[PDB]
Every structure is written in C-alpha cells, then in structure tokens.
Amino acid sequence: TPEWASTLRPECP
Amino acid sequence: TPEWASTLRPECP
Amino acid sequence: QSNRELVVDFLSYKLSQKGYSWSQPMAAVKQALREAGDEFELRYRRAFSDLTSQLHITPGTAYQSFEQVVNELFRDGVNWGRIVAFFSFGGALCVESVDKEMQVLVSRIAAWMATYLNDHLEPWIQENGGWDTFVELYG
Amino acid sequence: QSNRELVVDFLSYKLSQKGYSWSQPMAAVKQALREAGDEFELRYRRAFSDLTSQLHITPGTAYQSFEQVVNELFRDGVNWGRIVAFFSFGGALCVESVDKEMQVLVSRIAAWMATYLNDHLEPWIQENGGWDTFVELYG
C-alpha cells in the first residue's frame, strides 16, 4: 500500500 | 473398515 | 488469531509457488478424516442416524449434554472408527444448526468438539501413535 | 498437530457439502498475506533482496542470528508493511533451504517465525486491532 511503501528507506503493497 | 464395523452394536469404513 | 497457522500457510504457498510442492503438516490427516467421515455417513447410515438422533442443539444447550452423548459412544472403548463417528456427529449437529437459522451455534459446536478431543480423547490418540498413525493405517 | 485445526476443517467440509459456506476470518488473512507478499517481492524487489541478503540459513544457524536480522527490520517501529517483509523474508529462507536440499530447515524457520511473532509482534498486533485490521487495509 502507499502508506506502507512510504516507510521504506530512500535507498530502497 | 471391517474392524471398525465389528464394534458396532448388532442392531446398528 | 494463530500466528503459527499463518506462518505455515504462507511458507507452503511460497514454496509451492516456486515449484516445490510442499503441503501443510496436517493435510494428510484432514484428507483421511474427510474420506472416512464420508464413508461412514454413506455406508453406515443406521449407525450415523442413531448417533445424531440423540441430541438436538439450542442456544441454551450446555457442553455437558454433548459430552453425555459422546461419552456413551465411547463407553466400550475408544477406537478410530468411533472417533470418526464423533466427527460426523459434530458435523451433523452443525448442518442441523444452519438448517434452522442458528449458524451462531457452529463455532460453539467446534469448541465443544475441540474440548472433548483435548480433554477426553488426546491421551488415547497420543498413546496410539497420534493422528499420523490414523493416516498410516487408513489414509 | 492441532485437534482444533482438524475440527474446523471437517466441519467446514461437511457444511460445504450441504451448500453452506462457513466463513473463516483467518482465510481472508491468509489470502491477503499471500497477495501482499507477492506484491512486496515484485514491486519492491530491491527492499526484498536487501533483506534476504542479510542471512543465509545453515544447520548451524541459531535462532538468535535470525532474531538479530529481524530486529533490524523493525528497528524504527513495527508496521504492517514490515510484517509483510518479515513473512517474505522467511519464505525466501525456506525456498533457499529447499534449493540446497536442506528441507528440514523449513520447519525450523517456521518455528523461528512463530516465536518471533509471539514474542516481539503480538502485543503490537493486538494494539492495532488484530489481523482483521491488516485485511481491511490491504483490501
């Protein structure tokens, strides 16, 4: 989801 | 099974 | 609910997706039990109906009435065919409940059956090799 | 081998035979976790492979090595996405173990994942409404 995807580190459903 | 069936009461895989 | 069953489902899905047919741990027990219960209900209808005719559930029925009927079924000893009948009896109690618009009773019947197995049948099952033995003898 | 898993499977089967579909809420959880893991591994492959590169399981790997890597995954807090990554991580370890003909490690990894969920993640899961919240948010 967009809300989960935004917790990735910048270097990295 | 025959061994399961043999434990039914006479009135009654 | 159960983290363990979630883990086992996901790992089996992932392995099978990659080309390794894995199958969950109790898949063979479930299949053998379903098969034996189908055979019991089809080929031994007199024995099936005798057992089901002994209890009718209402929302006020207590576990003790279920346990009363099942204790009678095992009075002359536990064996695997009587355990098969206990499952078919529980299943009949569920179908009857849904037939009379009391679907809420299904999860209560499941809890009764799990309780009876854990309290009354597990010592014999484990003594006799566990459910894996059931699959080895009849699967 | 759970008596309750066996009971729920038999009743669900017997009910479907009469035309009744007993809803299992964990069935929706299992399906959402499968789909979310597939999407994580495909849409975020760099995040996925970054996690899988941190550990390779051998028969000498101790649980504490898995726990340290997963602890780093949750270093900045638990969220449902990191929990998806955790399931995908464990599935990649199982696929690798089977690739290397070390199939016994699958059951070991499955036990480590359950231990980690129950010791580290279950209070957070409960605080956030249980696995039903995951289903509602994923679709």
* Domains recognised in chain D with CATH numbers: 25-138 (1.10.437.10)
Interchain contact A8–D (C-beta under 8 A): yes
Which of C91, C105, C26 lies closest to D12 in space, CA to CA? C91
Which residues does chain D have within 8 Å of residue A8's beta carbon, measured at their own beta carbons? Answer: 44, 47
Q: Could you give the CA distance from residue C127 to residue C130 in angstroms, rounded to a whole number?
A: 7
For residue C115, CA distances in Å to C20, C86, D31, D35, D46 come to 36, 13, 28, 34, 47
Chains A and C are in contact, defined as 3 or more C-beta pairs closer than 8 angstroms: no
| Nearest residue in chain C measured CA to CA from B9 | C47
Which of D95, D57, D69 lies closest to C12 in space, CA to CA? D95
Q: Could you give the CA distance from residue B11 to residue B6 in angstroms, rounded to a whole number?
A: 12
3-state class (DSSP) for residue D125? helix
Burial of residue B5 (number of CB atoms within 10 Å: 0-12, 13-18, 19+) = middle
Tokens of C27: 């898949």
Interchain contact D109–C (C-beta under 8 A): yes
Q: Could you give the CA distance from residue C46 to residue C26 in angstroms, rounded to a whole number?
A: 30
Q: Nearest Cβ partner of A8 from D39, D44, D137?
A: D44
CA D74 to the chain's CA centroid: 15
The shortest C-alpha distance from D114 to chain C (Å) reads 5
Answer whether C39 sits within 8 Å of B13, measured CB to CB.
Answer: yes
Q: Could you give the CA distance from residue D3 to residue C122 in angstroms, rounded to a whole number?
A: 9
Answer whether C114 sits within 8 Å of D1, measured CB to CB.
Answer: no
User: Among B1, B3, B4, B7, which would you mutate to test the C interface (most chain C Cβ atoms within 10 Å of its Cβ)?
Assistant: B4
- Say what the resolution is, in angstroms: 2.0
Question: Residue type for B2, please?
Answer: P
Residues 6+ apart with CB under 8 A from C101: none
Rg (CA), chain B: 7
Answer whether C46 sits within 8 Å of B12, measured CB to CB.
Answer: yes
Tokens of C68: 């009363």
Burial of residue C2 (number of CB atoms within 10 Å: 0-12, 13-18, 19+) = middle
Which of D136, D139, D124 lies closest to D83 in space, CA to CA? D124
- DSSP string over D35-96: HHHHHHHHHTHHHHHHHHTT----TT--HHHHHHHHHHHTTT---HHHHHHHHHHHHHHHHH
Answer whether D81 sits within 8 Å of A1, measured CB to CB.
Answer: yes
Answer whether D47 sits within 8 Å of A1, measured CB to CB.
Answer: no
Answer whether D18 sits within 8 Å of C106, measured CB to CB.
Answer: no
DSSP 8-state code for residue C117: I
Solving technique: X-ray
